[model samples]
Target: LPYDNYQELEVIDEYLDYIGEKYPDVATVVNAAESFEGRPIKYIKISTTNFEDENKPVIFIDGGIHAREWISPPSVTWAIHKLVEDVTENDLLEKFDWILLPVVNPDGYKYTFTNERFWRKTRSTNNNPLSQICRGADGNRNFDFVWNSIGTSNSPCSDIYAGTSAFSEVETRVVRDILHEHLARMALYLTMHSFGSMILYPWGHDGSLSQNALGLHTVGVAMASVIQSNALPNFPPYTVGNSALVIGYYIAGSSEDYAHSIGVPLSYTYELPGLSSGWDGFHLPPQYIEQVCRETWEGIVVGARRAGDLFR
Candidate 1:
């Protein structure tokens, strides 16, 4: 079952362990690395055939990197449950290998649960003499591509503050490891966030389009279309395009950009819909959680099929 509340930390942990224990053959939970505050960063590998089969393409989906995006984690976790414990979607299993990291920045995510409800970025302190007051770095802005450039702040206290250096946060390092480990056959990479209905692609660090811009746009449109069809009638349709065009801003060091820079062919940042206005966008109503997940999964399936076809 999907989690009802974001504060259900113990439930999340227990569910992860339960999946690990019950599906040891296909699902192997790995503590890939630790977060800035030493929280274990974990992910699960799901494959009908062991990952050793080079012929199978890899599809990765991660959530909660931004911490305050409460709806993100549940969407990913529900996808995991649908794929493994519940076999409602058998074609997903038959087509490609899966990697689901439900909480990428555990420290920030837990902090959101325990301390501040709207926390974003990693809980890592910057050592810069000029930025001693800033205690956290925007995890999305800590990527190596166009590091600390447009749409980001050098000040450590800013919400969009990039880290002192590229790949500065250990949370990002864990993601880098996963991408590098499966680079040769990685077909698609998706980083989930919230408050906007968008399927954003690479060239986010700067406005330049990727060499495969056509393919990127095509798949992004497919994903967005699928989600829109499944969404509530009153909800805004998902927009598909480069980050700058869709979000009306550019961001460097984002997970989608970082994954693309390191050779993942298809990378996307999913901005899940929310209820609130302004910066309070992260505070989505609980009633819409299942609706969002249902619609988001449609997008994922569309993207996965397209990616599998492209890679094959």
Candidate 2:
């Protein structure tokens, strides 16, 4: 079924399994990693050439690393829908190989459904006596760029805690390895997040623009504008800018910054839309799920076409 609302992790997992089993030609389900609790973390690869085409650039998309951000994963599945099931924009698949990880942190995502709706880290337990109370590191801050220098806490209990070391969690290593393997032709890396209608680019470690700032800003605006144009009348228009400037804070070792630092030309963190009513926005009502997914897919389409133009 096309994703019509926010779904629990079980439903999401079932879709991934079905997509791979049902469509063997273009979609391949991969066990990206094993979570601390032993659940398999998976992603899907969509390619016309079975990802064997060395010439095509790769577009990477992942969501739900923060766990509580339920809206993020659906957009990814929506991307899969438009690409594999719906086939609305045929050029996107023809131009680039795709890696879509609908949920990067299955343990935390499961926690949100069964326990806490606002949990934002992995479910791995810390062994350190001083910090054992906390269970996980913020996956966004667990990358290798600046490695816990800013916007993170040394205390395991903090939401923004950096891990014990870079690539500390198995969940994040799945992404790290993919970026390393595909960096040569990685044209775009988008890590989906939520509660802000923004399209952000590196360097997220500091409020600085990349050397590819012009290309980044241009493509970002292109994606943002398309999403805004298709958005509901009451939804805020998408904001495109440097991550820190738009988010009003700086974070070291963000996945976007890590990907860009490792040579992915156009990497970004997509903060998806939420209502203006403060923190309650994270609880995106079920009614709005398909709309956000639909509108956000427009941005993904533009990004795909733009990457094909620039990189191909």
Candidate 3:
């Protein structure tokens, strides 16, 4: 049976808990922190051998940082299901450890489910009276490293508003802590986003390329190719390149860039396929869910194998 689409925050919570209970051996559900609205922010830690093995390379994957990206979180939770429940590719479990955070901005995700269908920031209010007009901070724009530069807006009401300071949102802090904790052995860091069929790598805050640019491009292309090979003909082909170069905009404080700045060798933001006719950027059709998840997993499998070869 196919997994249920997480249309509500409670359903997302139940899915996480169910996966953890069903795959107790490999899945460890962690309550990372409480969201701004006091919702428990949780993630799953999966490993064949418990994550205590320092020699094993860890792969971190997160989705739904942008609440409007409804397709993002399900793709991630699907990966967890495939890895633990289905085991279609046994090598994934044998090769690397995984940290999957399905919903990074819980408060915003909940808000999207309950109040607004296209919310895209953390539901936190600024102290300034002027800023209080806007109650959310763009989680993508709140990370460290060239923060508040280039592609972000200073006005709190703007869609891409950078907070008053870097790492201003607790959601970003939770991701930061995970990156630092696994810096020594992190093989790959993948953040899921939507509306573009692309796989992007850093220095997104600035236009400059990373020293590992060649390797990043090589693996990124491999990932895109693998996805395209399995994707529907109606879907556009995946583009692979520097975040700024591919998308034509420079976004500061993105998770991919922040992870790379702190020494994670491979970091990417996976923008999944968009629907045709200018409809459903993040609200992908229910009919396409299985196909997208399958193709996305194919990309992850290809990327993970390559990452293991590089780091192992």
Model number with the top lDDT: 2
Instruction: Please give the lDDT score for candidate 1.
Output: 0.84
lDDT of 1 by residue, 133-211 (tens): 5667888888788888777887788888888788888988888889889999999999999978988888886667898
lDDT by residue (tens digit), candidate 2, 76-153: 998998889899788888888999999999999999989998999998876687555788899999999889999998
* Residues 53-121 of candidate 3: C-alpha lDDT, one tens digit per residue: 778899999998999888898889889888898898998888889999999999999888889888899
What's the C-alpha lDDT at position 69 in model 3? 89
Ranking by lDDT: 2, 3, 1
How does candidate 2 fare on TM-score?
Answer: 0.97
Best model number under TM-score? 2
RMSD of 1: 1.7
Model 1 poorest 10 in a row by lDDT:
1-10
TM-score of each: 0.95, 0.97, 0.96
Off by over 4 Å in 3: 1-6, 277-279
Residue 16 miss distance in model 1 (angstroms): 1.6
